[PDB]
Design a protein that fits this description.
Helix content of chain A: 40-55%
Shape of chain C: elongated
Number of helices of chain A: 4
Number of strands of chain A: 0
Oligomer: part of a larger assembly
Number of strands of chain C: 9
Largest interface: B-D, 47 and 41 residues
Strand content of chain C: 15-25%
Distance between the termini of chain A: 24 Å
Chains: A mainly alpha (108), B alpha+beta (334), C alpha+beta (227)
Largest sheet of chain C: 5 strands, antiparallel
Chain lengths: 108, 334, 227, 337
C-alpha cells in the first residue's frame, strides 16, 4: 500500500510539472504514460479528442503499473503454497483496483 | 560411468526457405515464371464490440456508450488479383544428412554412445519410414496452412535440382493424398528414396517445391502474421501485420518446417486425430494441450535417456519419434 | 609520515596548499604500485582521521576481492535434480567431473554450482572423502591476491614472498587480521626473529622466510589448505 | 638463472578483415563485382516449450498452462534472394612476418634467447609446413563455417595483390581439398611459398580471398552473431542479432582468423577428429574440452618454457605448434588467470 501511495505521489509530481502537455521524441508510451500523466486540457486533445487526448484511460496505466509491480515483486512458483502468497497476490490485486478507481474518479 | 551431457545441441536437417507467394490463372501453371507476386496492402476495419465482456453487468447504458465508439483499426491484407484464381507458393528445401551428430556437447563418452545408438538405428533400418512421412507432407500441400482449407484443386510440383538445371520432376494432386493416413505410391516412393538418400549422407538434396491452389478470383490468401508493437496509435497496422520478403507476401520458413515434420502418429492419447508435429512433450499450440506428457514415459527426453543410458531401446515407433526429434534439432540441456 | 594499513600505504604530497584559508595536504592511498585514491585533507588531522578517511575505499576493495576470488561451490543433490542437500566450497575440482544431468540411476549427485553443470554420482562416503580432500579454508580468497609462484608446492619454482606480499596475511592491517606476535606464536618463534621477516630490504637485517614455515603459516592462518 | 619474462606480448600475424557477404547466380562468378549485398532482416518467431523441465514442473496442469501462454521473439535473419543461389564471401588478408619478436617484453636476456630460438627454427626449416597448412585452410573455404555445410559446389579465388592491381590468381575447388588431410598440389604449394615468404619477412603479402558457395535459391546464410544486451525488457524483444557492416551481412574478422589457423593435428588425444585451432591448452568451444591439457606436457607454455629456458627442444611438430602459437599472438606471462 505504501508503494501504491508513493506511485500516487509520484503522479502528483507529474501533475505539478505539466504546463505544456506536448509529446516529444522518446515519448512512445504516451498512449498510457502520457494519458496517466495527462496535463490540463489542451486544444489538440480537445472535445473531439475525448477518447484520444481527454480519454479516461486508467486500464492501460493500471496494467503497466501491475507489470512494474510484478517485475519488482516476482512471485515464486511455491511462494503461494502458504496463506502469505495468496494474501500478497490479493493485496496486489486490491491495490491495483484501488489505484484504478482513484484514477477513474480523477479521470475528468 | 556415463550420464547425459549438460549441453547438447543439434542443428536442424530439412531446412526450408521462406515460401514466396505469387498469383496466376489455372492451366497457366506450366508457364508460371512471370507470375506477379501477391502484394500486401492495407485497409481500415471498424467494428462493434464482439468479444465476451464480463456478463451479468446490470449497466446496458455503458454498453451502448461503448457501442458508439467504432474503435477504428488498420489491418494488413493480402488478396489475389481479380483476374487470377490460382495461388502459387514456391520455396526450396535442402536435405543434408548427419542427423545423429550434435553441434555442441559436453561429454565425449555420451557423445560417442549417442552416435553409436543412432548408428545402430540406421543399421536396423534406414530413414525410409521418416523420409516416407516427410515425402507425404511434401506431397500434400500441408505447408499451405489456411491457403489449403477450402481449395478446389491443389497441385504440387517438386523439382530435384542436381546441377543448375532440373534433374527430376514429381507431380502430385495434394487433395488426393490425405492429411490423415500415410499411403504408398511409386513416384512417392521414389521421392522418399531421394529424401532418404539425402538424410543418410549419401548425397546432397535440394528440392524446389511449387504449390498451386485454386481458390478463386480476388480471394484472400493467408501469409504469416508478424508481431505488432503497441506503442503506436490506432493507425499504422495497429491490429495486424503480414510477413513479406521484398514486395511479396510470404510464409515464415519455420511455418513450412512445422508443417513438414507433422508426422507424429505415435502419441499415446489418441490416433484418430491424425499426425502432429514432432516435439519433446509433443504439443500443439491450437489445443493448448500436451501429448507425450512426461507423467507417461513417452516424452522425447525420457525415451532418449532410457535408450542411451540404460540401453532400454523403446518400440520402433518411439525410435522413429526420437530420430525425428533429432532431425528436428533443438537445445537439449538443463 | 606515511601510514601503513596492511598492504595499503597513505602518503602525503610533500608540500601543502591553502584551501579555504586553512593549510591542507594531498594524501594518496596506494595498494602497492597501484594508485587507488587521492584526498585533500587538512592539517591538524590525526593519523586516525586520515585512516578512517580511506577505510571505506579499503573496505570496498576487501568486498570486491572477497567476491571476485571466492572459491568454487559443489552441491550434493538427490536424483531429481533440485533440492540441494549439501554445499561445500572447494578450492579445486574433483577432476572426474564431466557434464551431467542427474537421473535416478544413482541417489546422490555432486554438481557444480556454475550453470553448465559438470557433476558426478557419489554415495555419501566418497562425497565425504572429496569434501575432506578438496575443501577450501575460510580465507582462501587472499590466495587470489598473491602471485602464485609464492603459493606453489613445487619447491623448484617457489620463491619467498616479499614484505609487501607478507603484509597481506600478517599484520594488524592485513586481510587475516593476525598480528606479528600471534603469527610468531603460530610458528613457534619469538616476536623479534619473526619481525626480521617484515623489514622490507635485504640490508636492514632481513632474511627470507623458508618454504616449510611459509606454507605452514598459510596452513595455520586458514589461507591455503596445504595438505 | 634465466627465467621467463613477467610481461610478454606478441602482435598477431595473418590479419584478416571482416568478410562481407553478397549474393548472385552461379556462372556469373566472374562478373561478381556488382553483386548486391546480403541484407539482414527481422522476422517473428513463436516458440513452443521444447526444453528440459525440472521435477517442480512436469505436472500436467503447469505444463499445459505454460503451453497456453507462448513466447514471442523477433529474430535477425539473413537469406539469399529467391533468384540467386550463390553466396559470395570476400575478405582480404595480410601476411606480415617478424613472428619471433615480441611487441612487449620484460627481460632482455629472455628476449634475445627467444629470438635466437625462433632463428634456429627458421634456419632448420622454413615456414613451409605452417604456410602449407595456412594455404590449405585458405584453399578449402573453412572460413565459411556453416555456409559450407551441405554446399553443392565451393570455389575459392585468391588474388595476390602486389601493387594496386592483381599480381597472381589462384582458383581452387574447396570441396575437392579436404578439411581432414593436408595434400600436395603445385598451385597450392606456390601459394604456400608466397605465404612463407610473407611470414619470413622477405616480402609484403596482401591477398584478396573470395569464396563462392552454391547453396540454393532463398536459403539461409549464417553471418556472425552479435551479443544482445537487455536488462528488464518488455516481453517480445529481439533474441538474436547478426553482425553487419553498412547494411551488409558479415562475418567477424576473428571468426575468419580462427578458421584460418585450424592446423593443429598434433594434439596427444587423437588425430581421427581432425585439425583444431592453435591455442594454448588447445581447446574447442563446441566440444567444451581442452586438448593439450597441461597435466600432459604438450600445452603451449610448458613446451615454450622447456624450449627456451632449459633448451629442451621438443619434437618438430610440437615446434610447428609453438611457432604457430607465436604467429597467433597473445598475452603470455604473469597476467595469469
Amino acid at each position: 500500500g505504501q508503494i501504491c501511495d508513493e506511485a500516487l505521489q509520484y503522479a502528483a509530481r507529474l501533475r505539478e510539472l505539466e504546463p505544456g502537455w506536448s509529446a516529444t521524441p522518446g515519448c512512445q508510451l504516451h498512449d498510457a504514460e502520457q494519458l496517466w500523466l495527462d496535463p490540463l486540457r489542451a486544444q489538440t486533445d480537445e472535445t473531439f479528442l475525448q477518447r484520444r487526448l481527454r480519454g479516461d484511460w486508467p486500464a492501460e496505466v493500471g496494467n503497466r503499473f501491475a507489470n512494474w509491480l510484478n517485475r519488482a515483486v516476482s512471485s515464486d512458483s511455491q511462494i503461494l503454497g502458504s496463506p502469505e502468497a495468496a494474501q500478497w497476490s490479493q493485496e496486489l490485486s486490491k491495490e491495483l483496483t484501488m489505484f484504478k478507481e482513484i484514477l477513474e474518479d480523477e479521470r475528468d | 560411468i556415463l550420464s547425459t551431457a549438460s549441453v547438447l545441441a543439434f542443428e536442424r536437417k530439412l531446412d526450408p526457405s521462406d515460401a514466396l507467394m505469387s498469383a496466376g490463372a489455372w492451366a497457366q501453371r506450366d508457364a508460371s515464371q512471370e507470375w506477379p507476386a501477391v502484394t500486401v496492402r492495407e485497409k481500415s476495419v471498424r467494428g462493434t464490440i464482439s468479444n465476451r465482456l464480463k456478463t451479468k453487468d446490470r449497466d446496458p447504458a455503458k454498453l451502448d456508450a461503448s457501442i458508439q465508439s467504432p474503435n477504428l483499426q488498420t489491418v494488413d491484407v493480402a488478396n489475389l488479383p481479380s483476374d487470377a484464381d490460382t495461388l502459387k507458393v514456391r520455396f526450396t528445401l535442402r536435405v543434408l544428412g548427419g542427423a545423429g551428430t550434435p553441434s555442441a556437447c559436453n561429454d565425449a563418452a555420451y557423445r560417442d554412445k549417442l552416435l553409436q545408438t543412432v548408428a545402430t538405428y540406421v543399421n536396423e533400418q534406414g530413414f525410409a519410414e521418416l523420409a516416407r512421412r516427410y515425402a507425404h507432407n511434401l506431397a500434400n500441400a500441408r505447408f499451405l496452412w489456411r491457403n489449403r482449407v477450402g481449395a478446389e484443386a491443389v497441385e504440387v510440383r517438386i523439382n530435384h535440382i542436381r546441377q543448375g538445371e532440373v534433374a527430376r520432376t514429381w507431380r502430385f494432386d495434394a487433395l488426393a493424398i490425405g492429411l490423415r493416413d500415410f499411403k504408398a505410391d511409386a513416384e512417392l516412393d521414389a521421392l522418399a528414396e531421394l529424401i532418404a538418400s539425402g538424410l543418410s549422407g549419401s548425397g546432397h538434396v535440394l528440392l524446389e517445391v511449387v504449390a498451386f491452389a485454386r481458390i478463386g478470383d480476388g480471394q484472400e490468401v493467408f501469409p504469416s502474421q508478424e508481431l505488432i508493437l503497441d506503442k503506436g496509435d490506432k493507425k499504422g497496422q495497429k491490429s495486424k501485420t503480414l510477413y513479406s520478403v521484398r514486395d511479396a507476401a510470404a510464409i515464415h520458413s519455420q511455418k513450412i518446417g512445422n508443417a513438414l515434420r507433422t508426422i507424429d502418429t505415435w502419441y499415446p492419447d489418441e490416433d484418430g486425430l491424425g499426425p502432429i508435429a514432432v516435439e519433446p512433450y509433443g504439443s500443439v499450440t491450437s489445443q493448448g494441450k500436451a501429448y507425450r506428457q512426461p507423467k507417461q514415459k513417452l516424452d522425447f527426453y525420457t525415451l532418449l535417456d532410457n535408450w542411451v543410458l540404460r540401453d532400454e531401446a523403446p518400440a520402433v515407433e518411439q525410435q522413429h519419434y526420437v530420430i525425428a526429434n533429432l532431425i528436428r534439432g533443438g537445445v537439449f540441456g538443463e | 609520515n606515511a601510514i601503513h594499513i596492511g598492504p595499503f600505504s597513505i602518503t602525503p604530497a610533500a608540500r601543502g596548499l591553502h584551501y579555504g584559508g586553512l593549510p591542507h595536504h594531498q594524501w594518496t592511498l596506494y595498494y602497492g604500485p597501484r594508485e587507488m585514491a587521492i584526498k585533500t585533507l587538512p592539517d591538524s588531522y590525526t593519523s586516525s582521521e586520515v585512516r578512517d578517511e580511506f577505510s571505506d575505499i579499503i573496505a570496498e576493495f576487501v568486498i570486491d576481492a572477497r567476491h571476485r576470488y571466492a572459491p568454487d561451490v559443489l552441491e550434493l543433490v538427490n536424483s531429481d535434480g533440485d533440492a540441494v542437500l549439501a554445499r561445500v566450497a572447494v578450492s579445486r575440482l574433483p577432476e572426474a567431473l564431466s557434464g551431467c544431468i542427474p537421473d535416478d540411476r544413482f541417489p546422490y549427485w555432486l554438481l557444480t554450482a556454475s550453470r553448465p553443470r559438470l557433476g558426478l554420482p557419489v554415495t555419501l562416503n566418497e562425497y565425504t572423502a572429496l569434501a575432506v580432500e578438496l575443501s577450501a579454508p575460510p580465507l582462501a580468497w587472499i590466495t587470489g591476491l598473491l602471485p602464485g609462484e609464492v603459493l606453489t608446492h613445487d619447491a623448484e619454482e617457489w620463491r619467498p614472498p616479499t614484505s609487501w606480499e607478507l603484509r597481506h596475511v600478517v599484520g594488524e592491517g592485513s586481510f587475516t587480521g593476525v598480528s606479528g606476535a600471534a603469527a610468531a606464536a603460530l610458528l613457534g618463534m619469538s616476536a623479534t626473529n619473526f619481525r626480521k621477516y617484515t623489514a622490507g630490504d635485504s640490508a636492514a637485517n632481513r632474511q627470507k622466510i623458508s618454504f616449510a614455515a611459509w606454507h605452514y603459516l598459510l596452513d595455520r592462518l586458514g589461507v591455503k589448505r596445504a595438505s
